Amino acid sequence: AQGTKFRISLGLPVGAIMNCADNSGARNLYIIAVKGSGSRLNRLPAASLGDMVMATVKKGKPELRKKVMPAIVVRQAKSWRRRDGVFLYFEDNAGVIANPKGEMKGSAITGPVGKECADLWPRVASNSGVVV
């Protein structure tokens, strides 16, 4: 489901609590896995801007809580290197929740969206207000 993306710096390991950018009632997401992650002894699998993570809701609507459901990172605080040269980074981490196809459950996104997420996922760019 996930296409080709150039490697960017991994800023979100397992156990991170990122914000929730959409309007599906959830307040923050708790990352428990990264889809397509590697395998190394004692290594925590880490996420990045645009990866697809399995995540639970720790705060928000009680209907959304206590179930594991996939999510997509839209902002990142660790600085990454774009190919055209610049090192950039947002202010906080953020994610939106999705079905395992990649379609989005929320209606809109507040805050800016990273550009390598809008190219990779077609639904996130449809609901994005500001692209970087």
Partner: protein, 234 residues
């Protein structure tokens, strides 16, 4: 008429293409099958342009345009701006726009005559849209959503809107847009109707998983529908 096709394996066409009355825009990473949809049906009337915007392939959601003009965001480079000013005709004007709201496609829903913009867009853009596109600008939201370009496909004839939309507010917009409006779903139950499909006067292209009752609703409000080769020879 009502042709269906898809970019690489995605149903949404409005993200990856921008179809107007006098030109067309497509992203560069396409197969031979996706390009042959527009080339076979538009012919040589309007110029098809392969382009990218801001280093992206989402040019249907970054740009905003109609018959008379095109608006591109700030991160569009000078190499991509000089390419568009050649391939498009001399009638259309291309203008770079300085925004905090970068994605102009989700923000602006426009045609030849009447445009709806996001309510938190600023006044220096409202002066810019009305003088470049030559369109009256109306600040208004689709009943529950601020992204008016993603959830409301619009043409000169009619306009398809978000499915969860009250009838009492459709009559508001039809009073404002002066075109008849129908709510519906495209791509087998996706509420994002502006990003699923594109439209102009003589063509409307949507995704491959658009079902047959959904395709009836599209061509009806847009009024693009209308035989001797078929017959019995026994």
């Amino acid at each position: 008429m009502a042709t269906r096709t898809q970019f690489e394996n995605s149903n949404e066409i409005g993200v990856f293409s921008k179809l107007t009355n006098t030109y067309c825009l497509v992203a560069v990473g396409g197969s031979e099958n996706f390009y042959s949809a527009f080339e076979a049906e538009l012919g040589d009337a309007i110029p098809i342009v392969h382009t990218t915007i801001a280093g992206t392939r989402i040019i249907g959601r970054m740009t905003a345009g109609n018959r008379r003009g095109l608006l591109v965001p700030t991160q569009t480079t000078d190499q991509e701006l000089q390419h568009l000013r050649n391939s498009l005709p001399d009638s259309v004007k291309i203008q770079r726009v300085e925004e905090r709201l970068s994605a102009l496609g989700n923000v602006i829903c426009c045609n030849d005559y009447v445009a709806l913009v996001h309510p938190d867009i600023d006044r220096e853009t409202e002066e810019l849209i009305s003088d470049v596109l030559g369109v009256e600008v109306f600040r208004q939201t689709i009943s529950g959503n601020i992204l008016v370009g993603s959830y409301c496909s619009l043409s000169n004839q009619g306009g398809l809107v978000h499915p969860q939309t009250s009838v009492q507010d459709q009559e508001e917009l039809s009073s404002l847009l002066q075109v008849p409006l129908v709510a519906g779903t495209v791509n087998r139950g996706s509420s994002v109707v502006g990003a699923g499909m594109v439209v102009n006067d003589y063509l409307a292209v949507t995704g491959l998983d658009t079902t047959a009752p959904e395709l009836s609703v599209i061509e009806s409000i847009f009024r693009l529908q209308d035989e001797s080769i078929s017959g019995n020879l026994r």
